[PDB]
From a paper:
Ferritin is the main iron storage protein in most living organisms, playing a key role in iron homeostasis and detoxification. Ferritin has prominent octahedral 4-3-2 symmetry, and each ferritin molecule contains 24 C3–C4 interfaces, 12 C2 interfaces, 8 C3 interfaces, and 6 C4 interfaces, which provide several potential pathways for metal ions and small organic molecules to diffuse into its inner cavity. Thereafter, we introduced a self-assembling strategy by designing π–π stacking interactions at the shared protein interfaces involved in two different kinds of 3D protein nanocage superlattices, which is referred to as key protein interface redesign (KPIR).
In order to clarify the detailed structural features of AfFer, the crystal structure was subsequently solved at a resolution of 1.91 Å for the first time. Notably, different from the crystal structure of other reported ferritin, AfFer exhibited a BCT lattice arrangement in its crystals. The AfFer molecule is located in the center of the hexahedron contacting with the other eight ferritin molecules located at the vertices of the hexahedron through electrostatic interactions mediated by Glu10-Asn9’/Lys120’. Since only one out of three subunits constituting the C3 interface is involved in the formation of electrostatic interactions, the dislocation between the C3 interfaces of the ferritin molecules results in the lack of crystallographic three-fold symmetry; consequently, AfFer forms BCT rather than a BCC lattice. Notably, this BCT lattice differs from most reported ferritin molecules, which are packed in a FCC fashion along the C2 interface in their crystals. Also, the C4 interfaces of the AfFer forming the subface are close together, unlike the very few reported examples of BCT formed in horse spleen ferritin crystals or ferritin–MOFs. Based on the distinctive BCT arrangement of the AfFer nanocages, and the fact that the octahedral symmetry of the assembled 24-meric AfFer cage endows it with three C4 rotation axes that are perpendicular to each other, it was found that the intermolecular interactions at the C4 interface participate in the construction of both BCT and SC lattices.
Numbering used by the authors:
A (entry chain B), B (entry chain H), C (entry chain B), D (entry chain A), E (entry chain A), F (entry chain H), ...: 3 to 169
The structure:
Amino acid sequence: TIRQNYNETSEAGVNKQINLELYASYTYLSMAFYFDNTTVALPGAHKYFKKASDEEREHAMLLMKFQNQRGGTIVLQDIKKPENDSWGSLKDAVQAALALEKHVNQSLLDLHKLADSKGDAQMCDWIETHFLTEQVEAIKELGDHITQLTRVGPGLGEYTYDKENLG
Amino acid sequence: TIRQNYNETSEAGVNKQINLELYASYTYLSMAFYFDNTTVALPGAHKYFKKASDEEREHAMLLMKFQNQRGGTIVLQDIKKPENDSWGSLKDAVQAALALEKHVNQSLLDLHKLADSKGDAQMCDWIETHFLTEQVEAIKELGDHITQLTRVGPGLGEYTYDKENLG
Amino acid sequence: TIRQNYNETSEAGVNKQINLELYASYTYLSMAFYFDNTTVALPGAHKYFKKASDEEREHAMLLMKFQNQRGGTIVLQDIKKPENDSWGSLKDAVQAALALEKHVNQSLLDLHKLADSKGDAQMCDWIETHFLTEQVEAIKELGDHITQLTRVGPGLGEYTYDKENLG
Amino acid sequence: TIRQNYNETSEAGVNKQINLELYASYTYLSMAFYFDNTTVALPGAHKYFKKASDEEREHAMLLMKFQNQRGGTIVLQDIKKPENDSWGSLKDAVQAALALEKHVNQSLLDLHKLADSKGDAQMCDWIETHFLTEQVEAIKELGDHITQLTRVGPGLGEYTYDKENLG
Amino acid sequence: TIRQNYNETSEAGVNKQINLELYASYTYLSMAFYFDNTTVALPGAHKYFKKASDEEREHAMLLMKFQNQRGGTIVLQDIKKPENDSWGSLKDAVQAALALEKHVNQSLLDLHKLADSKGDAQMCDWIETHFLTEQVEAIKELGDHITQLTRVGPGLGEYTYDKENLG
Amino acid sequence: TIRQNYNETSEAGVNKQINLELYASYTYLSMAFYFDNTTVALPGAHKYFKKASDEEREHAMLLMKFQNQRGGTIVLQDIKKPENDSWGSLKDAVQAALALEKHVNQSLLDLHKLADSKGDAQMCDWIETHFLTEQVEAIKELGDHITQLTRVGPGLGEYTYDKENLG
Amino acid sequence: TIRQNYNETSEAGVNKQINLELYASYTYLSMAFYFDNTTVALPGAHKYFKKASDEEREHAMLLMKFQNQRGGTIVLQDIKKPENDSWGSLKDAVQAALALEKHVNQSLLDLHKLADSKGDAQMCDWIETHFLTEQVEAIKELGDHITQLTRVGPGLGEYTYDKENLG
């Protein structure tokens, strides 16, 4: 028996977070191959969102590893398909990415609060170490991308930011 | 318009195969982190099924690429959770993997037969090139693993085959 | 006598394909040096279409090699001059290239169907191996170029895509 | 006067933890040389617990350094002899190691909770940075070893795990 | 049970092809050591047909591997001795080699047609990948050797071609 | 909008800490060039406090970065001149440095307590990660320097400690 | 307007020479793959005439470049198929090559005389620099090959000269 100071509600919250990271991974996968579609043809955004999809899947696997380390049980659920089939302009897709990452961030802060209320000091620091600052940096980066995509405008500007920044 | 000799039924079959490969990826992820649970503790199988998950996700992404190359439209669906939460012995899990890969193979052979019925010579060769022989080799490897896992037996044999072969 | 399972209609079709690959080579040669003309002055497109002309000539020579390998007789015909003397905007030229490659692709699929109907298993696989997937990738690339050339627009955008992508 | 925001109960708790880490070091030293005894003769376990003894002495020294950093005073007490003179089977010893590390983990969580109740933000973070996650990983590793030692069984299994994993 | 979409007539055909490849290996071994005989003394042909014998044994082993991969059973038969004890001139032996490889090519095309009639897409592709184009190239090479051996003529020509081309 | 879980009082406290770190930077610059004055002439202390000034300016810039990352607004104020024009003995200056760093530490602990009262888990961890332990180590080092400067005494000792330790 | 001292008759003569060089390229391609036919089987001549084809295509492209550099307009015409389908002996083919190169040389000398009659000093030097001496050296080499092919004779000599000189 390795389980120690690990509440069953914290365990359920970790299972929930696993599914949300997988959901995010699959949303970015959808975004990546939308930009690979020949009617869209933005190869930098294809690469950028494919990497984001890999990173979110890494996040899901960090949480599954944590679930095992603390002596919980991983319980998987369906991965819901992304909210959209097509994602509009490059700026639209980055705006939807920012919305998703803020939603993931709120869920991580709720998970942290839950852990804190059960006195789970190791879990709180683990979430801070691997997630909370990473999420703040990702949100800042996407916000910067949105301001730049606004500045450069549609057409030539979108092509340029795709190739010179996202690629 | 890049689409040429690409049937709408073939396109839908590719979208079905994308979902099936993702389901396989998620089943192997489940298996991998089952073997990371402290009550199972088989690190070779954890590494082996984690790589199998990565490979099936690559398979899904090859099909997404092909969908775009031929001028179809990727349509994603929910990724259903794996059939089990826990996977029993190492032999049980390899047996479950064999059954899944044979299911995926029958799906690929049906997709090949469909593409052939619509005269899609490039699609047929593409499935042969990337999938049909890879699948036969995967099934042969899994069957060999099952025979070796039967030979070495439970207990010390399972530990040994996990570490010396799968890891 | 090396000839075996090689139908005389398949042989005629290979001679036809040789001439069409040479025709394509000469159309891309025309395109390349149109963009070298001082009133056009797009050096990236000059390079890009000169390479395409070399590649189509390589294709013609692969087919002549195949004709000899199977024991047929190469019969050459006039290479018709390209359809146009000048090719308009960079987007116009890439659109004409896409139209030509789809026409070449349809001819390759007809050649494959002909071979299949005569039971020429080696010829079918040879066409799949060297041509059918290459043609799908070339058609996808040109379609992507057209979407990007539309996105970036005339003037500065055309200059930029010429230098940063086609060059 | 460097002392700042450092409670004297926190300071007394750090002194208690120093003694517990030294007690753990000395328990693992006992175990290590039990496995070096000719009637036991498990060289992998000897090396593994010798390293564990070194690491626990490092932990004690980290806490002594921290006591000095915060302007407290180190106060040493007798290091109690280990609970047993001989440690049974390899599995028996890893089970006693797991019990000990859970006791040390509970002590660390109590020390953290004490620091938190006195508003010692830096001491809380220091315990998280150096101990809490290290302790969770050590406990998971020991649990995994117990599961594998059960799987391989006595005799040849014990010999094999000792040589191939612990050593 | 790894067997899937593998017809027992296909399996019996693979066993037949194994024996034919072994028969070809043994014919080329005969030829190779005929040219090593002191009354013949053509060292280039000795090396060339020894290599051909090795390659045909490799072909047999590829087919045995395939039989196992698809879940069939290898069934071996006597390897018949070669049709002749001595092989005449160098040109004579290359002519007999050409006749043999055309017979093997017809066997491979029949095996492919059989697999195709049972819907064995993977077996058809496997034969194309490993045999059909290799066989066309081997036949072209042998035909070219016969033409050059005719051109150089008997005596000094035979000596020269043996040393400079076959060797 | 990137701002999430970032309280306006926390934001104002970060602007206060930016100014305080800049004040510390400027105090250390004053000290550094006091020790460069020909009537003082302690080159080790000049180098030591110049680096301390660089480090506190880096601290201010880390907080400016954090303000932007969380979606706050940097608001700068006057940097007040240091408390003294001349700093007495080397021991006097290290004593003045210790008092300043303890003041900065109390400011950081108050900022941490404020962020904690508003549930800002990421800010709390960020202050722990970048400041709280760095501050404890800085205070410990300064206290040690003061004890050594007392031990070595004025005159030759001050010269020696300046050159051999601070420089 | 870059055009200067470039006569319209000279421009038309350059367009005529572009077509003639392309006709030569295609004649050499025909010859090259005649020698690759299994009933001819001379690999040195295949390589030699394939390179000659590449070189004449380079010649055409040099003239296209020159047309653009001087501010003319490239106008392409049909490339007539070669005069023969089969080229007889190796000596016959080199003899046909010599006659073609002398025809091309007379065309170049006529183009030079025309440029000279219009006072086009740069064009005259350009034809001298790139063509007139290259042509004399090509004709000398072909004449030497014909004398050597006469010396070595049919049969073994033709094989030897093909391999040792042309290849």
